[PDB]
Amino acid sequence: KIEEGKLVIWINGDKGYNGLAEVGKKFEKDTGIKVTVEHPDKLEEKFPQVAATGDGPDIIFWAHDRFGGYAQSGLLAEITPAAAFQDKLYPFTWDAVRYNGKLIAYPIAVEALSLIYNKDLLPNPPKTWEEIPALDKELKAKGKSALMFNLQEPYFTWPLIAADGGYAFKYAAGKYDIKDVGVDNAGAKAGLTFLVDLIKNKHMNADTDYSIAEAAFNKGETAMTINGPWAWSNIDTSAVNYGVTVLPTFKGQPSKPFVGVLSAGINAASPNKELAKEFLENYLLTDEGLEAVNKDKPLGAVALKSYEEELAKDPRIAATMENAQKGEIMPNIPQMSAFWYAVRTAVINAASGRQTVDAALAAAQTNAAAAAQLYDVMDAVPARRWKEFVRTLGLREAEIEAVEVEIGRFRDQQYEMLKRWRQQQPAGLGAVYAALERMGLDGCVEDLRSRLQRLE
């Protein structure tokens, strides 16, 4: 459990938590502060349940796409590093973790998918997605396959869909518009249709996930896979001679992977914020800190400039960064949740044949665009009435109601955050104010008197 005088960190199990634990032991050796790293299941979903409780972590690690919601709900502490420290990380990595003009996390590394081919089976990897059907059958003649990758998570199948024109939300004037969802445009329809055709000619199987796809490549059963740097570790241990190169082109235009920024967010309810800032700045985000984690599971291209020149020499990094520039940086807005869920539903149905491509994408468009609107009213729907609300609207689509749950859980962390604040323990002042300002006249007076009290 969390309490004053120690750090608890959450990171996804596919990353190098053991190496991260090493960095904390140094910290513990230098400060006497016990550092404990955990890797829970679905920490992306478990966090918004337990953040503002005594069961949430001090530091949370995830790609930058989740943090906008976290931030909007006032569940993160404003990161306040000196200019000299900011000038040690790449500026565009700071953009990712910047939401509404405020820094909400420490950017760690850059994550971008890449084509991971087996050199023993593929000296000249294909340049285009349209070459692959011919190569696979040639490998079918060897009882082999050309490609296998996780098909259950939309993270991995997006690069092909967004190649010719598909996108999440339109970007313009330096801003995203959540009403313009580019999941059902011409460029998106072609990518998925091309993907399914690969499966329908049984160049792939729909049940392929990370665990199995990983096994396939690691045992030299498929010539290619698509995965991130964190996966090179297990592959390095396996006896496969592999290469990491650029993703294949499609219709002249490259497959555009959503680029990820691994980021470290400080719980606003953590009683050891400065204690955390000390760790991330002066231990992890150092040439040795990052080296310790990378040795466990490769991070990719780090945001720390001093240690990026070190990794840039690795061709597998050069491959990723190329794909990174070719692809797009994930938005960090609170609506990316609505976008992901809708797509996760669409691909599984268009892959299992349960629906047309035109249908799933049409439905995903609607559900995402609609569910994306729920966030603008998250703070308005008065307290005790969020379930009555969403039940009043009665949308009932599985991916839509998933956002409802999330939002319903955000509102529950803010009430909890308010509870902590009332009892004089750490709390995020935004989560507090959002809760009072929907708690009738009594909330608003309580809200403002604090705003006035706070003016000291």
Ligand X SMILES: OC[C@H]1O[C@H](O[C@H]2[C@H](O)[C@@H](O)[C@@H](O[C@H]3[C@H](O)[C@@H](O)[C@@H](O)O[C@@H]3CO)O[C@@H]2CO)[C@H](O)[C@@H](O)[C@@H]1O
State phi, psi for 351 to the nearest 5 degrees.
Answer: -85, -40
Distances 241 to 11, 121, 126, 312 between C-alpha atoms, Å? 29, 9, 17, 20
Nearer to ligand X, 43 or 89 (CB): 43
Judged by beta carbon, residue 111 or residue 404, the one nearer ligand X is 111
Binding positions for ligand X, 223-252, rule CB under 6 A: 228
How far is residue 64's CA from residue 391's CA, in Å, rounded to a whole number?
Answer: 31
| 308 scored as a contact of ligand X (CB under 6 A) | no
Residues in 69-108 at the binding interface with ligand X, rule: CB under 6 A: none
Which amino acid appears at position 413 of this protein? Q
Cβ-based nearer residue to ligand X, 176 or 421: 176
Q: Among candidates 135, 86, 101, which has minimal Cα distance to 115?
A: 135
Q: Is 214 in the site for ligand X (CB under 6 A)?
A: no
Any contact of residue 411 with ligand X (CB under 6 A)? Answer: no
Task: Choose between 262 and 427: whose C-beta lies nearer to ligand X.
Answer: 262
- Give least dist CB 339 to ligand X, A: 9
Sign of CA dihedral 401, 403, 408, 409: positive
Nearer residue to ligand X within complex by CB, 39 or 251:
39
Residue with tokens 């949740």: 337
**Window 155-194: contact mask with ligand X (x via CB under 6 A):** x---------------------------------------
Please give the Cα distance from 91 to 260 (Å, whole number). 15
Chain positions 335 to 364 lying near ligand X, rule: CB under 6 A, are 340-341, 344
- Residue 340 beta carbon to ligand X: minimum distance, rounded to whole angstroms: 3
Q: How far is 311 from 299, CA to CA, in rounded Å?
A: 10
Candidate list 2, 66, 192, 319; residue touching ligand X; CB under 6 A: 66
* 65 vs 446, beta carbon nearer ligand X: 65
**Which CB, 273 or 344, lies closer to ligand X?**
344
The pairing of strands 114-118 and 242-245 is antiparallel
Q: Does residue 67 sit in helix, strand or coil?
A: helix
Least spacing, CB of residue 345 vs ligand X, in Å: 8
Rounded least distance, CB 95 to ligand X, Å? 16
Provide the mask over 116-155, with x wherever binding to ligand X is found by CB under 6 A and - wherever it is not: -------------------------------------xxx
Member of 7, 16, 35, 65 binding ligand X (CB under 6 A): 65
Whole-angstrom Cα distance, residue 16 to residue 294? 7
Of residues 153 and 291, the one with the C-beta less far from ligand X: 153
Is residue 234 within 8 A of residue 138, CB to CB? The reply is no
Binding mask 4-43 for ligand X (x = CB under 6 A): --------x-x-----------------------------
Strands (E), 362-432: none
CB-nearer residue toward ligand X: 45 or 278:
45
Q: Measured from the CB atom, is 126 or 228 closer to ligand X?
A: 228
Alpha helices in 222-354 (DSSP H): 232-237, 273-279, 287-296, 305-312, 315-326, 336-352
Residue type, 277: K
For residue 134, the minimal CB distance to ligand X (Å) is: 29
Q: Is 415 in the site for ligand X (CB under 6 A)?
A: no
Q: Considering only residues 56, 260, 265, 408, which one is a binding residue for ligand X as defined by CB under 6 A?
A: 260
Q: Could you give the maximum distance between any two Cα atoms of the chain, in Å? A: 76
Task: Select the span of 24-32, 58-66, 311-319, 377-385 touching ligand X (CB under 6 A).
Answer: 58-66
Q: How many helices (H) and strands (E) does the chain have?
A: 20, 17
Q: Would you state the structure tokens that stand for residue 173, as one six-digit string?
A: 């004037």
* Residue 45 sits in the site that holds ligand X (CB under 6 A): yes
- 196 or 364: whose CB is closer to ligand X? 364
- If binding means CB under 6 A, how many residues of this protein chain bind ligand X? 16
Residue 372 near residue 335, CB atoms below 8 Å? yes
Give the helix ranges, DSSP H, for 201-284.
210-218, 232-237, 273-279
- Residues in contact with 42: Cβ distance below 8 Å, sequence separation at least 6, in sequence order: none
| Closest separation in Å from C-beta 260 to ligand X | 4
Q: How far apart are CA 171 and CA 281, in angstroms?
A: 32
Residue whose CB is less far from ligand X, 67 or 242: 67
- Residue choice 50, 51, 63, 160 for contact with ligand X (CB under 6 A): 63
Find where tokens 């470290």 sit: 264
Instruction: Confirm or reject binding of residue 111 to ligand X (CB under 6 A).
Output: yes
Please, what is the minimum distance in Å from the beta carbon of residue 349 to ligand X?
Answer: 13
176 secondary structure, DSSP code: E
Cβ neighbours of residue 166 closer than 8 Å, sequence gap 6 or more: 158, 182, 183, 185, 187, 188, 189, 191
Q: Which residues bind ligand X (CB under 6 A)?
A: 12, 14, 44-45, 63, 65-66, 111, 153-155, 228, 260, 340-341, 344
